[PDB]
Amino acid sequence: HGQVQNFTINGQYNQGFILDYYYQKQNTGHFPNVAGWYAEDLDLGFISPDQYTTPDIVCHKNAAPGAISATAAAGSNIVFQWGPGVWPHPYGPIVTYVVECSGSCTTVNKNNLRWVKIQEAGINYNTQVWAQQDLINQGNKWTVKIPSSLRPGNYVFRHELLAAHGASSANGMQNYPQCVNIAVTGSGTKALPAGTPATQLYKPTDPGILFNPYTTITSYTIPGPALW
Ligand SMILES: *[C@@H]1O[C@H](CO)[C@@H](O[C@@H]2O[C@H](CO)[C@@H](O)[C@H](O)[C@H]2NC(C)=O)[C@H](O)[C@H]1NC(C)=O
Ligand code: NI
Numbered sequence: 001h002g003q004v005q006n007f008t009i010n011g012q013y014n015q016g017f018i019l020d021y022y023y024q025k026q027n028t029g030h031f032p033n034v035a036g037w038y039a040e041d042l043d044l045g046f047i048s049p050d051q052y053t054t055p056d057i058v059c060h061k062n063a064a065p066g067a068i069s070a071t072a073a074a075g076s077n078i079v080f081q082w083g084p085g086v087w088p089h090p091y092g093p094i095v096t097y098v099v100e101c102s103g104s105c106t107t108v109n110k111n112n113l114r115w116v117k118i119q120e121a122g123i124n125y126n127t128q129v130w131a132q133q134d135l136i137n138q139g140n141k142w143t144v145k146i147p148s149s150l151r152p153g154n155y156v157f158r159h160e161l162l163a164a165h166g167a168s169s170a171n172g173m174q175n176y177p178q179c180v181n182i183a184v185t186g187s188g189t190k191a192l193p194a195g196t197p198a199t200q201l202y203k204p205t206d207p208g209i210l211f212n213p214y215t216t217i218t219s220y221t222i223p224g225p226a227l228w
Helices: 019-028 131-137
Strands: 003-009 012-015 070-073 077-083 094-100 114-121 141-145 153-163 174-185
Touching (some): 003 070, 077 153, 077 174, 094 131, 131 153
Antiparallel strands (some): 003 077, 077 141, 094 114, 094 153
């Protein structure tokens, strides 16, 4: 359990969506305009395999686009900061996707977004240590590079932890997707390819979704489509 509360682009601070804003909205009808998506999981919980074909897998529970967008040059590093507490969950991979928006991302139909994998990290076979343990050891921070070749445009980045402590059972994998609006500028010239609807990323029986984390692992298939 946890959420992306803020993030940096080339060191520069950007405000993310925090749970306090959900309660602001309940009380007053409005909340601060931020690049992180609004979402309604009040515990900072997860989406389950039985929800892999539902709108909630796109950007988490009842999610809606942030009212503004951040911005970054292609080749920039994003550092997602998870919180408010230390990440609980030392087992599992970390993946990040990007999708382009037709028009502003602030008003996009999330269900029409098509995702391209730009980062993935699993288990180090020699240490048996997962990417999520590395996240805990890096102060809840994860670095993702925006591909240098990516052409300017309005994009959404979908950063996701797949906590695998329960993955040996059907429906046990816990997905924590978090979306942020980040427009891209600069000197990249390549269009994003066709990509994959979020509802087609994962199946409950995929080899890296349903597996035993409590035994020595010599081969692991990180879930989702191929790295771009
Ligand atoms: C960016 O988000 C992080 C992560 O939640 C915030 O860091 C937390 O800050 C609180 C309040 O000071 C501390 O009690 C926690 O220990 C921190 N958690 C972690 C994991 O670092 C940080 O405050 C946010 N930045 C801003 C400016 O709001
Ligand atoms: Ni949790």
